[PDB]
Write a protein that binds this ligand. Sequence first.
Ligand SMILES: Nc1nc2c(ncn2[C@@H]2O[C@H](COP(=O)(O)OP(=O)(O)OP(=O)(O)O)[C@@H](O)[C@H]2O)c(=O)[nH]1
Ligand SMILES: Nc1ncnc2c1ncn2[C@@H]1O[C@H](COP(=O)(O)OP(=O)(O)CP(=O)(O)O)[C@@H](O)[C@H]1O
Ligand SMILES: Nc1nc2c(ncn2[C@@H]2O[C@H](COP(=O)(O)OP(=O)(O)O)[C@@H](O)[C@H]2O)c(=O)[nH]1
Ligand SMILES: COc1ccc(Cl)cc1C(=O)NCC(C)C
Ligand SMILES: [Ca+2]
Ligand SMILES: [Ca+2]
Ligand SMILES: [Ca+2]
Ligand SMILES: [Mg+2]
Ligand SMILES: [Mg+2]
Ligand SMILES: [Mg+2]
Lengths: 352, 438, 425, 54
Amino acid sequence: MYTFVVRDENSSVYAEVSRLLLATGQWKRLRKDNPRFNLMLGERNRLPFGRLGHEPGLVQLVNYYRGADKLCRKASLVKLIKTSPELSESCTWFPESYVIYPTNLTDEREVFLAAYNRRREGREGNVWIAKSSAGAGILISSEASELLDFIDEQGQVHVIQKYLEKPLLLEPGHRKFDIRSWVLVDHLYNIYLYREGVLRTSSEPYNSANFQDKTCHLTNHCIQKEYSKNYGRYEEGNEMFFEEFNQYLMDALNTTLENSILLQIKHIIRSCLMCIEPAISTKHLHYQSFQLFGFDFMVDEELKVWLIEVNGAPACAQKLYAELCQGIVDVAISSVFPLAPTSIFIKLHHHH
Amino acid sequence: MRECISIHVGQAGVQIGNACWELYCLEHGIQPDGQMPSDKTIGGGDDSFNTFFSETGAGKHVPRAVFVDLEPTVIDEVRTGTYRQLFHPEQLITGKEDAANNYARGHYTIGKEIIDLVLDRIRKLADQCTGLQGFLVFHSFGGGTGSGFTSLLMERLSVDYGKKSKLEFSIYPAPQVSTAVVEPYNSILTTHTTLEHSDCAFMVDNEAIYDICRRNLDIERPTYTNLNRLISQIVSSITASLRFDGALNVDLTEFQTNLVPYPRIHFPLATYAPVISAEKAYHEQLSVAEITNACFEPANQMVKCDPRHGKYMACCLLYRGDVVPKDVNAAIATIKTKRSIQFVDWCPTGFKVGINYQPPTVVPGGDLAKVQRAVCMLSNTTAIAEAWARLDHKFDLMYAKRAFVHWYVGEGMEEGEFSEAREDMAALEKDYEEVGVD
Amino acid sequence: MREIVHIQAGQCGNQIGAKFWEVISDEHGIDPTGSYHGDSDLQLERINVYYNEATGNKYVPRAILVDLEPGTMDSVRSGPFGQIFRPDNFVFGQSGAGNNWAKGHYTEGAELVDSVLDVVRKESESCDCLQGFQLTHSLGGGTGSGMGTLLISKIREEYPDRIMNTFSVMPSPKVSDTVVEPYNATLSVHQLVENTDETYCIDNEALYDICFRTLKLTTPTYGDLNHLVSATMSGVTTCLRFPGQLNADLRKLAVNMVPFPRLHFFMPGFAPLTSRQQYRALTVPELTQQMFDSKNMMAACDPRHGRYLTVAAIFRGRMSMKEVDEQMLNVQNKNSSYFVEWIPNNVKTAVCDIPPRGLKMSATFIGNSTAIQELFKRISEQFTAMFRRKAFLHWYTGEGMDEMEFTEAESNMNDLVSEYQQYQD
Amino acid sequence: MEVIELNKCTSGQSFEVILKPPSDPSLEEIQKKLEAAEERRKYQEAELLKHLAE
Ligand SMILES: Nc1nc2c(ncn2[C@@H]2O[C@H](COP(=O)(O)OP(=O)(O)OP(=O)(O)O)[C@@H](O)[C@H]2O)c(=O)[nH]1
Ligand SMILES: Nc1ncnc2c1ncn2[C@@H]1O[C@H](COP(=O)(O)OP(=O)(O)CP(=O)(O)O)[C@@H](O)[C@H]1O
Ligand SMILES: Nc1nc2c(ncn2[C@@H]2O[C@H](COP(=O)(O)OP(=O)(O)O)[C@@H](O)[C@H]2O)c(=O)[nH]1
Ligand SMILES: COc1ccc(Cl)cc1C(=O)NCC(C)C
Ligand SMILES: [Ca+2]
Ligand SMILES: [Ca+2]
Ligand SMILES: [Ca+2]
Ligand SMILES: [Mg+2]
Ligand SMILES: [Mg+2]
Ligand SMILES: [Mg+2]
């Protein structure tokens, strides 16, 4: 009879896993402060890792990799890419990014203006996007004066990265989109990619001559469902799944999702996670870790994939809650606490 | 030459002191009867081993140690054990009834009526020192004596010996080998009143020594003898610089200079390797790089924690056996490129290395096998603060309901001394977070 | 040299205490004449905790026998091990207590108490370092209850810093001598709540049912109930009589078992309990599953009705200490809803190599459960069923007492219940 | 990767390697604390005996 606790009532994902665990009749739930547990579904922030793995006779398991914030923070991810030799500054699949601290507080202000003045002098497209983690708060502008003045009006760290002025547009619609991939990493640090991704598409045609209206530029599910007037027109909930998207790539572009995009996504995930493995691995740790990640990608009109950000506490598409949650129990939990396919994941083999 | 006086308080301190002095004697070639054939100066001399041993006219080498316990059962083992001939009765002080795992009882009730005796016995060992450096205090956090009487002894030592350094070897409480529920209280009480009196403290989590014995020595259920034989190896490696010719950590002052830039943060984390089973057929001897690489594995740390998520303030490497500087630097270069070693920006990113060519001495018939080289790393990591968080948390669970509090108030303590001690820890956790996290 | 002074008072007190010295004397190799004839040194290691060493290597139980009538103690002296007890330590009267607390506490008992304390003071003056006292007695009678508590009240006055421990047989109507037993028990319970550090609650009903249902005894006797108390008493005291680090002395055990001064009433438990299939080897999982089962507990309180404050287990015999930990850690991690979460590690375990007589291995259970409030709830409901009509009060008022003192004992124990109630939530 | 202060002797040697540069109570007051606790005990035992006298 395995025991587990819950310390994040707002998690739509592990809320289902908890419902599934109890449905097995072999997992028992305890109060959120009972240290005698096998599995912790811990809080997002200030998760007390230091108190894990100190109960005699209990093998304890947690659903967050301590130190993964280095990959799931806007400024942290950028700092990780430019410093880690495994990724280098010349990284080809990550937009040219810079970390900018508001002037009311290292800082890459002058480094950003240099590359900004070289592009302005070379006639090249010079549209940048400013954003931060403390957002629902984004500004898209081609003028460096506006981007900087916008950050100074705030009080937290921000990041300016090159805006993809040539994104792949779906037809009919002439609309933008992003791709979400759910990746699971078990205690053994196997990298499993969920065979099912989603495209959170924009219901508004893309307009390159007006970054003031951010309804056709931002593909966030909440922005389209509030400020967009064509929500749910071409697909249900602005969510196109890999089947329809794969049929489109073959009818219009004469290629496959696997060949044109999925290969690059699988390469990115490996390089991001393999980089930080020696920092977060729980191979010889007194407790064990496993975490679900949500990667966001961009696709330009040349079928190149760019990495936007990584989400540490991602939600799931409504239609994929059952299949994915059950998979988490199979490869991440039961692998350590077995119960008395055609795997739904795609293992990304690598060198530990 | 300058002398060092060792003090062992409580059962944990006393038994650990037994295992060490057994080890010191094997290392310096001292026999159970105190004789030392290698010492050519009979009845005197200022050699490096004289920092721990005095000499009589008859040629006996007598430890500079005092054993204190409020109950005589554990110290009687010393008076009749294998090394009974080393000590004389003045060195072994025993009461008649212990502190019942009650810090208040050891510190106030019982401690007040015996404190003046200990100081006198220690004063007698000080009168044999031509230039005393300081004291090494072995004790436990959980025991009533180890926690309660120690904190008092430290308060008085800082009064009778002002300019002298004091180092602790504290035993962190671990349920797997403990039958006392109030040990969090004692640990947090003793850390509070002892903090401003100790200059450097090596915490040892029994949980760590326990799992290292089960994992590396294949001991299904390790005894205190097992835990102590291992803990005496670590202690030996840390005190070796004081007992042997050398230029690193040559006096107790150097321990604070090299490991403690900030006063309150004086709890270095210790890592030791290799620990090899004597019952093993025959082990492939590890290189310098392999044993140094092991110093950054959580399984070999005296306290379980994750240094990858802390910041180093200092770092020493103490080697014993077949080791030459050339090999040490090579392993360090390879570990930096693979490991996560983040230092605080106001401290240099460096390693002080000491090497003693004599390899570790293993107690005949013990659990550990003889190796040709071994290392012990002392690194001041903010990650050790995890240990305080664990301990302080349990303290809050019981104190929120005032459980067991009446036992302390009943020996004369004030309930306010709890929260006062707890708030001192909350500040100690804050100083650690102010130094490590961004 | 941490000596314990034993006191046994009254009929029940002395018949149980007698069998108690029969059981441990066997374990330490002490024959009925006081001579040692064991084969191991672990027997004598901690022998002076309960025995004094006389001339000729004779061991004399450090025990005082007390009663207001000669009958029971005359049987002890003529009994099996009767010749081992110190002759002077037989302090007894002739009037009897008539199952009256008032008589044992204020009138008859008070006339004999000074002479019992003369013997206690004589056994203590010879102790190198006295740990404390342990009293065996019933609460439903007149002597062990009325005078027993009178003795504790006076031993605490003369020895205020020594541990006072008692084995108290609680009364039950299904196993009853007189209808006044709830009166005597309610009055004693207040004394114990004030002047005892540890009280092992033993409900005669729980003992009866264990003999009837589990031991398949068709018609139990007081002797059969006393066999259980003997074995239990031998069990909880193993930590004291043999070389062990866990709960070594009486005060250390209190510091780990009593988180609040008034909640010091324990439910003991034994295992195995086998009916005569008695030769079957009992495994460690079996020892543990039974040891925690309520049917093996002697308070007649269902633990699953309250929460455990602290727990102390003791395993006796040659076994796998690794397999003990695995199973103990299993029971905790399978029912963590019945252990309070605000006391980390409130379940300790001690191993002993010497098993009791006739068993390869065994386990003794010591629980500080809030479920004990059910015991004091029964006693209170029976007390009030009669006191509301003032029934049978004339036996007590005739001895000097007033109805007010009854109303106080009533409110005092209802408080004790309310105290056990707030810590269950 | 610098090595500084290399000291060698018969029984070993010690050195230092730099990878990157940076960027009480008096005796009177202890006796009072002790006597203060000894006083709180004496008071509590008096209340116990006073209680036992009543
Ligand atoms: N490593 C190690 N730990 C020990 C040893 N003896 C006791 N301990 C630990 O010490 C803690 C209890 O403190 P003790 O040293 O036994 O208590 P004390 O100093 O004798 O003080 P008293 O309460 O008066 O008995 C427990 O957590 C034990 O795990 C030992 O020999 N080696
Ligand atoms: N460099 C870039 N070029 C083009 N579009 C970009 C971009 N960076 C971000 N976007 C747009 O912004 C959206 C993602 O914003 P971002 O991820 O920075 O904020 P966020 O983290 O609150 C959304 P989520 O966490 O749900 O993925 C995408 O829909 C994408 O279209
Ligand atoms: N277990 C057990 N209980 C007893 C025994 N004798 C009496 N009792 C119980 O003790 C209570 C009566 O107390 P008793 O010892 O006769 O009073 P006293 O002798 O005057 O002090 C009743 O509830 C009985 O059930 C006995 O030998 N064993
Ligand atoms: C009140 O009597 C008892 C209470 C309990 C037990 Cl276990 C046995 C007896 C007994 O043997 N009575 C015999 C007598 C009533 C004739
Ligand atoms: Ca000499
Ligand atoms: Ca000082
Ligand atoms: Ca008379
Ligand atoms: Mg986000
Ligand atoms: Mg002790
Ligand atoms: Mg009777």
